[PDB]
Symmetry: D3
Subunit: 316 residues, 6 copies
């Protein structure tokens, strides 16, 4: 049932940015550290019961010399092919989401499902500096350089640089997509790299953290609350939100210049409607936000049609 | 709650066959050799706290993987040597380093150090994450005994003991290790791997009889394992994960404990099932005793606190 | 956590059939009532954002002159093509499962997702004879002739005769698939018709009703318990179970001659492992049951690979 | 715990009517179709362990030639007797509610507990046009002519026609009572027929649908939400509410001319206070709404004393 | 869903009695203390919206000089009348259950709904000896003399002695009825007094306490477990069970010689089927137990017909 | 998660007092009845495994000639020592809370953990006048004279008089502390007696009863709601609240003149923030309220440090 701001209110909700003075400098330096790592991608054939598609396990080196992976599925016909980098949900990847990746290739897209560090797969070489609450949301939260998603965002940009380098891929028809965590990486990737032509984000996560901890009624935003319960020093809370600000979609959305499509369910308790309208309302670009009254944080049928139409129009 | 596991008559007879591989002993010898190669380089710094008669410090030391471990150390404000305790905390259950409990132990007469478990209540963990895993620490690096989360943790426990006994104010002959659940497992593991501790006190120890635990536990965190197999369905992965887990399973380490041990179990415990705790207990061959509480689960058990204090006082304080 | 019989007990679980002496006759009669209704199918183009596949809304007349419907998607290329009749779960059809029907066509199969009477769509002309518990499980439960699933099973048989007639369909490479209620429809269709070549049923429902009501921990089997609570006459419980025997998979499984592939998660509280093992253990045909210890009533990734390999082997071959 | 509009806000809550321009015609027309079916009621002796009262099984024909039934209990003494038609809750009728009907007869009332189509009993010859969410709330919801409650409301009116025709019944002393779904049938019956002298409705359901789906926290209003999730077409939502408007109490309330007593508990999560206050505020007749701060959707002891005193005053005496 | 022993097993379940050597002596002593208190009952008319029944608020003095009360409804017609004393469930009495009391009177029974000390009503003079767990279950549990149900059981006996003295009541046609706690009071009263002719007990409580605490999944048997958690002395648990044995139906049942009708739902999580079968299997009288697979601790429609037929046969239309 | 009034609004929440005109005389009368009971305290050595502390079982007579008890632990060194009377939570006392009591003595305070009547221990001689909801909240709620907390508050005052008379106790350095129920007792004790030097109360209970029953989401305030459901006479509700007003912290807080430290967790569903801010805002003394956004009704680690520093400052050093 409804629980967040009213719809009239959500449409006008646009929280002041929390980005620090050194926000762009942090990302410039981060992208430069990523650049210092040679990608050295590898592609190995992977048997799968499907006709018309060739499946591979793709790997590449990213920030911190971490070996990143995921399945890459390509239409079995001569290219150049339109492509997609699909990002998965938080702790929501089973067997690398291989079936859905294959189905995307069947729709006509060379598709790579980047597995998020320590989650669905992929190596995470970044150290754990100290205590944090159960989960990945607060790993390294006391510094923008050590935070879990610094490496993850850089991995998303690297996935795009790798896919763009493949001869069978048309660099002008690449899209990034995903839901919740996947939606945020899609948006973070587009804000950080001009490689992607379009972005589709279902109820994006990692947005408007300061309101999120006070409105969400389910994990994983609440990991932050759990963290502050275990580390009570007021300075810790201050520092954590400062760290979080560098990865917040309301601060990154301004850099997105790609046509963008988003979705939000009004009864979503995991990624509150307000947090998602906040990210949306910070985008200055070709955009559309589809609103579903009776849906939450789940697969939304009607949106799947919208998403397919949007991608087809821009990439097919 | 209500009874759910094997009957009490059956629990007393439950001694599951050991799952230790033929290189179980060599893996630990090797692991300890690697630990030995890291110089402790302990640091101590004064920490203010509103208590009279006890001095508190923040203690740090280097361990396996060149990881900096930390925790609060409280000492009676009187002339030593003092008997000591290394206390280990529960899974994801440390708040502000457990400082109030550590100080209380020092008021009882013990120089106490609450080792903070890597990335949970504190302490650095330099071990990389080799691949995907389920939410939590239970399956981090589970595909190899060399990379498994608890490898470094077990070593940090042993290192804590080596650091504490080197203190001049500590009576090396009167050190005890205590803890509940994850904490009780670390206490038993430290005792199996080190002759330093004199006594062991473990409240419903975790990390025991993993193969039964995944089929009987009804609450987290043993179930992170089940969650890991859901996300990684290759049969070989389940076989490999349990092989890794055997090197850290209390039913395989317990037989190495030579110290008088005090344990407790609540019969309605859904987190560390009675059967899993009796299994660890039944594999010990040492001066021992298991206190059974019919009406308690995974929580503070008042009657056992008295047993615990009387036990530590008997073997250490007095 | 684990809750049903132990794996070793499940493997041998084969409850005695509950079928009455007029069981074969009942279906014979029921199929004759169906044959009396001319299919008169209609096809209409339905736009969908995908390349290489053509979508349609198909309808046809079935038992009780009920108009049955569903989406039908065809690979956009030279046929004939192998085909699949996909059956959806109990009250689990959203927008006719159009997105999944289209994906089956992309895999190379002319696919029709029959919408079950009153659930995902389709008309149900059968009258409600008296009171029943909320839901479809007990509608008309006091007579094999008026029971909800009679019309449904027949509709599934009729779907096969319609698909079979399509010029772009290879009538010799047709499969029936579904999970739970859908898995039961697949097995029942293959038991009542020789049209399907192979069957895939994920944790089938409508199996071993008498044990089901004593072991399920969630809906919908419990609708039967709910019905007995509201209608306490002992003779009602007796009649109710007599009616259900005509639709129980443990009594229909023996007629299946097509190779079959099934799945079961051992922590499934909707279609308990024992009830699924009962249906499987009554099949006498080339069969295989994939067992997943850590899964329940849900999508099982590893079984999707098995499923795709199986259909490819027997159909797309 | 409190969750809806505050009490002072609730007393002032009067949502704008959603009745379409042809609201009145639709009902005059439905009532005409009902009149075409001859009631032809049957009464059969039904044994029950009670002195002073005689019980029967009453049946009659109604809208769509549906055979409606329920128990009829009468005071074992010379009439004319005052009478009551009691309507039951959604999916809440156990063994016809006989015990309560017998108790009402003991209080001096010839009582008939009409059983709602397919729920507590009674036949529903209405066909299911297409797909809908589990339950009766959305059956035939895409059209006012096919909607589940059309036949039910008409059965309610026919119930009154049948009872008043009985010789042992004082046609001038007939009341209609019920809780939730029953509170709504009693209000609808009164709105559609001038047969009842008074109305008692405990927290009536089927009221202010548009707000109900946004405030209800438990079933069954939420079946409408479930329906919209499964049939996403925006015009379907529009169509569904237009259909529902014809049966909504906020639109029927204005036709009730009988003295009316109602009740509402402030923590009711099934029939939210605002939806009940909505119905009450559209009533223009001798009325009274009893508010109970600490009660929910349940038997309210203090209101039973009110309901008995109210019926005693207007009917018995 | 099912959870206890198999029906086959339940029928055979008859736990050995826990009664102490002084079980009978304790009850003799308690009844004698009751006798020392003069009933001094009062009757005040009570307005109610019903025709053909007169209602009163009845009060009387009992054990510990406690004033017990409850509604007493009488059919408005010349008697004598058969009668019923109705006992209510644990913490489950709303406005004295007056509506059900009136209806019983409408079925032809002079009915008294005894309110249980401190719950639905009635005063309770017994002091609280010491700490106990939230609720009435462990109040005064360290001694049979101070235990909460000692006063309540005696109150049920006094109720029968008071109702029987009424002119409009046929003393040879009185029944005791109730569900759970109330079904327990019914049985206990019949065991302690020969005043009632028959007994109707829906899924009776306070039975087989030692098994109860290990099988029950909901309150209030679990208040005992709560009590042990807060008072860990092993000797406290030993004494608690000794105290409870004096009020346990498995020990009292043997004293009942009145025709008795009982009911149990197989999914009852409050009064486990085994605990109810234990009570039933210890009765040696004309008895019947109706078993209902699909019901739990709740109103069972089918058993209401059974209950009404049983009361009619033994009370309204006989003796 | 957050649910009450926002922090800005909580800071200014000060409900109008509900104290009756006879409020002061009621307490004066009560205190005098307590005075007529001679304390006749007893001390008994109690063995416990701890060095540096001697423990005893202390008992004393109080209001209504009830024998109150609890553990008393004293530093094993020459005194006088500062002292604390510790009050426990509602139904939350296990084995007299002896481990915490001993720990306070190790921190340097002669500590007495009073067991509250019938809960953690202690005899309660007051008679139950009639029916009430499960629990202690509504026992004797129909009269200020018979209400459960009357004997309890007096018991607390008597505790202070006994401990202060001990020759090893420095009567000028005594503190009262406790959480929830224990916090209300510490406050009430300080309001009725000038013996305590300071007060520490974690999320105090028994405060702003009229709002509490409309905002609490868990037990035990809801016992009052339960009470009203079982006793529906409007006058009973009126009387219940008049009785409660004599024990409500918003009315007693004005009498506290001791430095006071309080705490509250913003997600506390047992003692809602507004009810605790209500109590705080009525104090006119040296006071501080520590606010913890991410904590509820539980041990707050950060507050323990504040607590210990505050006690050390006023009592130890
Ligand atoms: Cl950090
Ligand atoms: Cl959600
Ligand atoms: Cl790994
Ligand atoms: Cl537990
Ligand atoms: Cl039927
Ligand atoms: Cl499941
Ligand atoms: Cl429709
Ligand atoms: Cl409700
Ligand atoms: Cl006691
Ligand atoms: Cl139950
Ligand atoms: Cl009172
Ligand atoms: Cl809380």
């Amino acid at each position: 049932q409804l629980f967040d701001l009213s719809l009239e209110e959500l449409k006008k909700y646009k929280p002041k940015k929390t980005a620090r003075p050194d926000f762009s400098d942090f990302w410039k330096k981060s992208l430069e550290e990523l650049r210092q790592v040679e990608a050295e991608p590898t592609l190995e054939s992977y048997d799968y019961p499907v006709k018309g598609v060739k499946v591979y396990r793709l790997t590449y080196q990213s920030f911190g010399h971490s070996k990143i992976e995921g399945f890459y599925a390509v239409p079995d016909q001569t290219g150049p092919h339109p492509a997609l980098v699909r990002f998965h949900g938080y702790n929501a990847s089973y067997d690398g989401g291989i079936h859905d990746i294959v189905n995307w290739a069947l729709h006509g897209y060379a598709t790579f499902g980047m597995l998020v560090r320590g989650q669905g797969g992929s190596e995470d070489t970044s150290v754990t500096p100290g205590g944090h609450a159960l989960g990945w949301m607060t790993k390294g939260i006391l510094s923008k350089d050590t935070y879990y998603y610094r490496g993850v965002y850089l991995d998303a940009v690297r996935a795009l640089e790798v896919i763009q380098s493949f001869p069978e891929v048309d660099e002008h028809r690449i899209g990034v997509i995903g839901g919740s965590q996947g939606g945020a990486l899609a948006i973070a990737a587009a804000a950080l790299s001009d490689i992607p032509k379009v972005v589709v984000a279902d109820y994006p996560y990692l947005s408007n953290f300061e309101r999120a901890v006070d409105v969400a009624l389910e994990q994983p935003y609440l990991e932050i609350n759990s963290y502050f319960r275990r580390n009570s020093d007021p300075k810790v809370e201050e520092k954590a939100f400062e760290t979080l600000s560098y990865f917040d979609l309301i601060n990154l959305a301004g850099w997105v210049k790609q046509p963008t499509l988003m979705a939000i369910g009004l009864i979503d308790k995991i990624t509150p409607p307000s947090t998602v309208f906040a990210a949306y309302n910070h985008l200055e670009t070709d955009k559309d936000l589809k609103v579903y009254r009776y849906f939450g944080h789940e697969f939304i049928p009607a949106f799947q049609t919208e998403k397919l139409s949007f991608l087809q129009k821009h990439l097919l």
